[PDB]
Amino acid sequence: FTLIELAIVIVIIGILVAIAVPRFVDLTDQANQANVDATAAAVRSAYAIATVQAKG
Amino acid sequence: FTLIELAIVIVIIGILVAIAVPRFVDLTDQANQANVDATAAAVRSAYAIATVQAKG
């Protein structure tokens, strides 16, 4: 590579770095809560259906 | 409520409706006739008792 091409590369690397980038976040607490809540809704419906099947 | 529970409800409502149900009927004519007849029997007895009391 010519020295000019390396100079251009040295410039552009410095500009394509110094972007923002997202953090990874452990969102499993929020997702676990929604899983527990959705499951609780399912248990209530499953119970209601069971009261008809059981006739009691 | 879950969509399944609502689906089950939509089914069962449609089946617990479409029973027969009795009409109310104005049976007061038949009851009034029986009242008049029972009262007429009472008047006859009250009259008969009165003929003894009155000695005439």
PDB file of C-alpha atoms in Angstrom:
ATOM      1  CA  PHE A   1       0.000   0.000   0.000  1.00  0.00           C
ATOM      2  CA  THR A   2       1.177   3.575  -0.643  1.00  0.00           C
ATOM      3  CA  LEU A   3       1.824   5.977   2.261  1.00  0.00           C
ATOM      4  CA  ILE A   4      -1.180   8.060   1.115  1.00  0.00           C
ATOM      5  CA  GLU A   5      -3.532   5.047   1.389  1.00  0.00           C
ATOM      6  CA  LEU A   6      -2.188   4.298   4.901  1.00  0.00           C
ATOM      7  CA  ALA A   7      -2.687   7.990   5.874  1.00  0.00           C
ATOM      8  CA  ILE A   8      -6.306   7.852   4.611  1.00  0.00           C
ATOM      9  CA  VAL A   9      -6.840   4.590   6.575  1.00  0.00           C
ATOM     10  CA  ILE A  10      -5.360   6.162   9.760  1.00  0.00           C
ATOM     11  CA  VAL A  11      -7.876   9.040   9.365  1.00  0.00           C
ATOM     12  CA  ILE A  12     -10.965   6.895   8.628  1.00  0.00           C
ATOM     13  CA  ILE A  13     -10.319   4.313  11.404  1.00  0.00           C
ATOM     14  CA  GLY A  14     -10.299   7.196  13.911  1.00  0.00           C
ATOM     15  CA  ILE A  15     -13.754   8.325  12.652  1.00  0.00           C
ATOM     16  CA  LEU A  16     -15.479   4.905  12.334  1.00  0.00           C
ATOM     17  CA  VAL A  17     -14.403   4.324  15.926  1.00  0.00           C
ATOM     18  CA  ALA A  18     -15.816   7.005  18.310  1.00  0.00           C
ATOM     19  CA  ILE A  19     -19.357   6.080  17.355  1.00  0.00           C
ATOM     20  CA  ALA A  20     -21.799   5.193  20.097  1.00  0.00           C
ATOM     21  CA  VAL A  21     -22.491   1.458  20.569  1.00  0.00           C
ATOM     22  CA  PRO A  22     -25.287  -0.086  22.746  1.00  0.00           C
ATOM     23  CA  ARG A  23     -24.547  -1.843  26.019  1.00  0.00           C
ATOM     24  CA  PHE A  24     -25.813  -5.355  26.447  1.00  0.00           C
ATOM     25  CA  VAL A  25     -28.202  -5.363  29.438  1.00  0.00           C
ATOM     26  CA  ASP A  26     -29.428  -8.273  31.555  1.00  0.00           C
ATOM     27  CA  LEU A  27     -33.161  -7.710  30.919  1.00  0.00           C
ATOM     28  CA  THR A  28     -33.981 -11.207  32.259  1.00  0.00           C
ATOM     29  CA  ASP A  29     -35.674  -9.759  35.392  1.00  0.00           C
ATOM     30  CA  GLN A  30     -38.304  -7.887  33.321  1.00  0.00           C
ATOM     31  CA  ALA A  31     -38.758 -10.882  30.988  1.00  0.00           C
ATOM     32  CA  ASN A  32     -38.996 -13.318  33.962  1.00  0.00           C
ATOM     33  CA  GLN A  33     -41.677 -11.110  35.557  1.00  0.00           C
ATOM     34  CA  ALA A  34     -43.717 -11.152  32.317  1.00  0.00           C
ATOM     35  CA  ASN A  35     -43.281 -14.960  32.100  1.00  0.00           C
ATOM     36  CA  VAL A  36     -44.550 -15.362  35.702  1.00  0.00           C
ATOM     37  CA  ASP A  37     -47.507 -13.014  35.036  1.00  0.00           C
ATOM     38  CA  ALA A  38     -48.487 -14.697  31.727  1.00  0.00           C
ATOM     39  CA  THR A  39     -48.180 -18.095  33.469  1.00  0.00           C
ATOM     40  CA  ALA A  40     -50.368 -16.835  36.359  1.00  0.00           C
ATOM     41  CA  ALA A  41     -53.066 -15.833  33.813  1.00  0.00           C
ATOM     42  CA  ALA A  42     -52.832 -19.332  32.285  1.00  0.00           C
ATOM     43  CA  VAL A  43     -53.162 -21.003  35.744  1.00  0.00           C
ATOM     44  CA  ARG A  44     -56.325 -18.951  36.486  1.00  0.00           C
ATOM     45  CA  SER A  45     -57.912 -19.993  33.160  1.00  0.00           C
ATOM     46  CA  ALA A  46     -56.800 -23.638  33.607  1.00  0.00           C
ATOM     47  CA  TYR A  47     -58.385 -23.588  37.093  1.00  0.00           C
ATOM     48  CA  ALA A  48     -61.643 -22.065  35.788  1.00  0.00           C
ATOM     49  CA  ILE A  49     -61.834 -24.744  33.025  1.00  0.00           C
ATOM     50  CA  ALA A  50     -61.078 -27.403  35.693  1.00  0.00           C
ATOM     51  CA  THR A  51     -64.071 -26.248  37.840  1.00  0.00           C
ATOM     52  CA  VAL A  52     -66.391 -27.099  34.907  1.00  0.00           C
ATOM     53  CA  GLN A  53     -64.680 -30.487  34.248  1.00  0.00           C
ATOM     54  CA  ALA A  54     -64.737 -31.365  37.989  1.00  0.00           C
ATOM     55  CA  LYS A  55     -68.366 -30.114  38.378  1.00  0.00           C
ATOM     56  CA  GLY A  56     -67.085 -28.581  41.645  1.00  0.00           C
TER      57      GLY A  56
ATOM     58  CA  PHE B   1     -58.597 -13.383  31.230  1.00  0.00           C
ATOM     59  CA  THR B   2     -56.808 -15.408  28.532  1.00  0.00           C
ATOM     60  CA  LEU B   3     -58.235 -15.671  24.990  1.00  0.00           C
ATOM     61  CA  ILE B   4     -58.923 -19.385  25.623  1.00  0.00           C
ATOM     62  CA  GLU B   5     -61.073 -18.610  28.697  1.00  0.00           C
ATOM     63  CA  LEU B   6     -63.041 -16.006  26.684  1.00  0.00           C
ATOM     64  CA  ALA B   7     -63.515 -18.569  23.849  1.00  0.00           C
ATOM     65  CA  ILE B   8     -64.825 -21.144  26.372  1.00  0.00           C
ATOM     66  CA  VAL B   9     -67.176 -18.475  27.836  1.00  0.00           C
ATOM     67  CA  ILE B  10     -68.449 -17.547  24.325  1.00  0.00           C
ATOM     68  CA  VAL B  11     -69.260 -21.263  23.767  1.00  0.00           C
ATOM     69  CA  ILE B  12     -70.955 -21.915  27.141  1.00  0.00           C
ATOM     70  CA  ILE B  13     -73.089 -18.714  27.130  1.00  0.00           C
ATOM     71  CA  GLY B  14     -74.542 -19.839  23.778  1.00  0.00           C
ATOM     72  CA  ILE B  15     -75.555 -23.205  25.342  1.00  0.00           C
ATOM     73  CA  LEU B  16     -76.925 -21.978  28.717  1.00  0.00           C
ATOM     74  CA  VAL B  17     -79.094 -19.627  26.677  1.00  0.00           C
ATOM     75  CA  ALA B  18     -81.400 -21.526  24.238  1.00  0.00           C
ATOM     76  CA  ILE B  19     -83.007 -23.390  27.108  1.00  0.00           C
ATOM     77  CA  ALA B  20     -86.766 -23.305  27.451  1.00  0.00           C
ATOM     78  CA  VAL B  21     -88.153 -20.925  30.113  1.00  0.00           C
ATOM     79  CA  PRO B  22     -91.814 -20.766  31.341  1.00  0.00           C
ATOM     80  CA  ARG B  23     -94.120 -17.895  30.440  1.00  0.00           C
ATOM     81  CA  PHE B  24     -95.798 -16.056  33.253  1.00  0.00           C
ATOM     82  CA  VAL B  25     -99.580 -16.458  32.808  1.00  0.00           C
ATOM     83  CA  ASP B  26    -102.432 -14.422  34.282  1.00  0.00           C
ATOM     84  CA  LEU B  27    -104.173 -17.340  36.051  1.00  0.00           C
ATOM     85  CA  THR B  28    -106.251 -14.899  38.153  1.00  0.00           C
ATOM     86  CA  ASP B  29    -109.483 -15.842  36.299  1.00  0.00           C
ATOM     87  CA  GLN B  30    -109.246 -19.511  37.392  1.00  0.00           C
ATOM     88  CA  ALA B  31    -108.205 -18.503  40.931  1.00  0.00           C
ATOM     89  CA  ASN B  32    -111.013 -15.875  41.139  1.00  0.00           C
ATOM     90  CA  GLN B  33    -113.561 -18.511  40.057  1.00  0.00           C
ATOM     91  CA  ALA B  34    -112.356 -20.883  42.812  1.00  0.00           C
ATOM     92  CA  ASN B  35    -112.513 -18.006  45.350  1.00  0.00           C
ATOM     93  CA  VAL B  36    -116.129 -17.221  44.313  1.00  0.00           C
ATOM     94  CA  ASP B  37    -117.098 -20.925  44.478  1.00  0.00           C
ATOM     95  CA  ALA B  38    -115.436 -21.517  47.890  1.00  0.00           C
ATOM     96  CA  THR B  39    -117.107 -18.311  49.157  1.00  0.00           C
ATOM     97  CA  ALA B  40    -120.493 -19.516  47.802  1.00  0.00           C
ATOM     98  CA  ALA B  41    -120.064 -22.783  49.783  1.00  0.00           C
ATOM     99  CA  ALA B  42    -119.290 -20.710  52.906  1.00  0.00           C
ATOM    100  CA  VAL B  43    -122.410 -18.510  52.368  1.00  0.00           C
ATOM    101  CA  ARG B  44    -124.626 -21.639  52.090  1.00  0.00           C
ATOM    102  CA  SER B  45    -123.225 -23.052  55.364  1.00  0.00           C
ATOM    103  CA  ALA B  46    -123.448 -19.639  57.104  1.00  0.00           C
ATOM    104  CA  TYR B  47    -127.099 -19.414  55.967  1.00  0.00           C
ATOM    105  CA  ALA B  48    -127.885 -22.950  57.199  1.00  0.00           C
ATOM    106  CA  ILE B  49    -126.311 -22.149  60.623  1.00  0.00           C
ATOM    107  CA  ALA B  50    -128.305 -18.866  60.658  1.00  0.00           C
ATOM    108  CA  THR B  51    -131.634 -20.758  60.162  1.00  0.00           C
ATOM    109  CA  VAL B  52    -130.963 -22.617  63.452  1.00  0.00           C
ATOM    110  CA  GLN B  53    -129.928 -19.408  65.313  1.00  0.00           C
ATOM    111  CA  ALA B  54    -132.969 -17.501  63.938  1.00  0.00           C
ATOM    112  CA  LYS B  55    -135.331 -20.474  64.630  1.00  0.00           C
ATOM    113  CA  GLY B  56    -136.793 -19.611  61.198  1.00  0.00           C
TER     114      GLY B  56
END
